């Protein structure tokens, strides 16, 4: 049965790779839209100094 | 220490998988004997943290096996001066007990 204990190990085992390698993925994923939406709240925070100044002038 | 390097040494002659932290490997043993491996297996990976099964399967033997003769402090010497002429094949009838 050790030929087929070894099957299944070595599915696992793709399995387990593809796993990994997935979340690398998506780590490079998740950073891109990290520095994508810092841009966007720092926009926020612009356009809302911008208003603050104009209240001050 | 001897008993370390003797470990250490058994577990070189074994392949180690690569994709993960196990080791699979072919032993030969006694069938009879087998129970009390896979006590001595249970005992040994309860010590060990993480209880792996440490599942011991047969598999369809088909090469030459050892030949193991049960020996004690009296039969041994006789086993051994049958043994200084060949190793009886697999199964064969034993001559010691009539040496």
Same mark, same amino acid.
């Given at each position: %049965?050790?030929?087929?204990?070894?099957?299944?190990?070595?599915?696992?085992?793709?399995?387990?790779?593809?796993?990994?390698?997935? #979340?690398?993925?998506?780590?490079?994923?998740?950073?891109?839209? #990290?520095?994508?939406?810092?841009?966007?709240?720092?926009?926020?925070?612009?356009?809302?100094?911008?208003?603050?100044?104009?209240?001050?002038? | @220490?001897?008993?370390?390097?003797? =470990?250490?040494?058994?577990?070189?002659? /074994?392949?180690?998988?690569?994709?993960?932290?196990?080791? =699979? #490997?072919?032993?030969? /043993? +006694? @069938?009879?004997?087998?129970? %009390?491996?896979?006590?001595?297996?249970?005992?040994?990976?309860?010590?060990?943290?993480?209880?792996? +099964?440490?599942?011991?399967?047969?598999?369809?033997?088909?090469?030459?096996? +050892?030949?193991?003769?049960?020996?004690?402090?009296?039969?041994?010497?006789?086993?051994? =001066? @049958?043994?200084?002429?060949?190793?009886?094949?697999?199964?064969?009838?034993?001559?010691?007990?009539?040496?």
């Amino acid at each position: %049965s050790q030929s087929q204990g070894i099957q299944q190990l070595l599915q696992a085992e793709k399995r387990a790779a593809e796993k990994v390698a997935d #979340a690398r993925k998506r780590k490079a994923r998740r950073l891109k839209q #990290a520095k994508e939406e810092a841009q966007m709240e720092v926009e926020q925070y612009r356009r809302e100094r911008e208003q603050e100044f104009q209240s001050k002038q | @220490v001897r008993k370390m390097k003797a =470990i250490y040494h058994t577990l070189n002659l /074994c392949n180690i998988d690569v994709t993960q932290k196990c080791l =699979i #490997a072919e032993v030969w /043993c +006694p @069938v009879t004997d087998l129970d %009390s491996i896979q006590f001595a297996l249970r005992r040994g990976t309860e010590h060990s943290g993480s209880t792996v +099964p440490s599942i011991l399967n047969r598999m369809q033997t088909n090469q030459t096996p +050892p030949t193991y003769n049960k020996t004690n402090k009296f039969t041994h010497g006789f086993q051994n =001066i @049958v043994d200084a002429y060949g190793i009886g094949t697999y199964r064969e009838i034993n001559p010691a007990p009539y040496t």
